[PDB]
Write an enzyme that holds these catalytic residues in place. Sequence first.
Site, PDB file in Angstrom:
ATOM      1  N   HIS C  43      32.629  32.917  41.580  1.00 44.01           N
ATOM      2  CA  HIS C  43      32.347  32.329  42.888  1.00 44.01           C
ATOM      3  C   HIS C  43      31.252  33.076  43.634  1.00 44.01           C
ATOM      4  O   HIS C  43      30.699  32.546  44.602  1.00 44.01           O
ATOM      5  CB  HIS C  43      33.624  32.229  43.752  1.00 44.01           C
ATOM      6  CG  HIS C  43      33.997  33.502  44.421  1.00 44.01           C
ATOM      7  ND1 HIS C  43      34.986  34.325  43.948  1.00 44.01           N
ATOM      8  CD2 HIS C  43      33.488  34.122  45.511  1.00 44.01           C
ATOM      9  CE1 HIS C  43      35.060  35.409  44.705  1.00 44.01           C
ATOM     10  NE2 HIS C  43      34.145  35.322  45.647  1.00 44.01           N
ATOM     11  N   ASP C  99      38.036  32.876  37.547  1.00 49.73           N
ATOM     12  CA  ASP C  99      36.936  33.276  38.433  1.00 49.73           C
ATOM     13  C   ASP C  99      36.261  34.531  37.878  1.00 49.73           C
ATOM     14  O   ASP C  99      36.518  35.660  38.299  1.00 49.73           O
ATOM     15  CB  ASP C  99      37.495  33.503  39.829  1.00 49.73           C
ATOM     16  CG  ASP C  99      36.426  33.718  40.867  1.00 49.73           C
ATOM     17  OD1 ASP C  99      35.235  33.472  40.576  1.00 49.73           O
ATOM     18  OD2 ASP C  99      36.794  34.134  41.988  1.00 49.73           O
ATOM     19  N   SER C 198      34.331  40.567  47.433  1.00 49.33           N
ATOM     20  CA  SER C 198      34.689  39.776  46.276  1.00 49.33           C
ATOM     21  C   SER C 198      33.675  39.979  45.150  1.00 49.33           C
ATOM     22  O   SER C 198      32.502  40.305  45.360  1.00 49.33           O
ATOM     23  CB  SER C 198      34.904  38.320  46.666  1.00 49.33           C
ATOM     24  OG  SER C 198      33.697  37.713  47.040  1.00 49.33           O
TER      25      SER C 198
END
Lengths: 11, 28, 250
Positions: C43, C99, C198
């Site tokens: 992502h 992910d 992230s």
Amino acid sequence: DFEEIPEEYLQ
Amino acid sequence: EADCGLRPLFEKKSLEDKTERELLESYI
Amino acid sequence: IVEGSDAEIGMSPWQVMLFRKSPQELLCGASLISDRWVLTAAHCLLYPPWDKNFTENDLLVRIGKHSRTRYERNIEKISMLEKIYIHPRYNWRENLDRDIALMKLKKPVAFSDYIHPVCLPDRETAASLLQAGYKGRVTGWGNLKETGQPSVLQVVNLPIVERPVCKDSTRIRITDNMFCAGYKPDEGKRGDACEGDSGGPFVMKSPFNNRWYQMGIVSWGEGCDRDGKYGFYTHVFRLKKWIQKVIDQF
Ligand code: NA
Ligand code: NA
């Protein structure tokens, strides 16, 4: 916000 | 790599970081 | 990182900053897994709901860093990307299942006191260590609170949470390719990843061989450090056959 990085890395 | 996960400034010198013991204590 | 502390120098020498070329800004964390491969969250590179679909030439990786904003002359190394590889079953449409992404560097990076790869887990290390209550460590340059930004890399240690508790904390569908971590409301202690962390690593130090292993990738959450919520991480071991296939083929 960020210090400029050497131009060699942006070429 | 053969040397993965061994930090130059810690494991490679036999120095511990300030909080790794917290991790070890949780591995019960 | 919320409710963490400043990293020590060289504490996370596998930590990578994903950096947007223009405008120059922090995009995500990432990790160094060899001299030419960097692991991150898919992502960070591809998220169509937000019009995000970066190409190799849009980005740089900065390795060996401590300060968030400084150019750390003679310490950090800046690498261009040769190729991005997204997991082919990364589910950006729904719940961020799988992910994970890899970035191959144009040239190998030189290891140093500040730059060194993390290990990826084997099946046995994952089975032993991925247990509720066992703590891992998350690092990054993301925000210090949900609603600000750190001078240097931040670190927090967080316990893995029982799968039913993770499931019962959210309406999002959880999969076996995810785990969650964080303290419960009744535990007192706090901490979480936040925006900008992230893609960075969730690591554990094996008590068997005293090596650091990357068990997770900072993937998703609902707020930062909210009571009764947990951070969700990509389960690296579950996706390791894909990592190996990419590295072996390319
Ligand atoms: Na639920
Ligand atoms: Na929480």
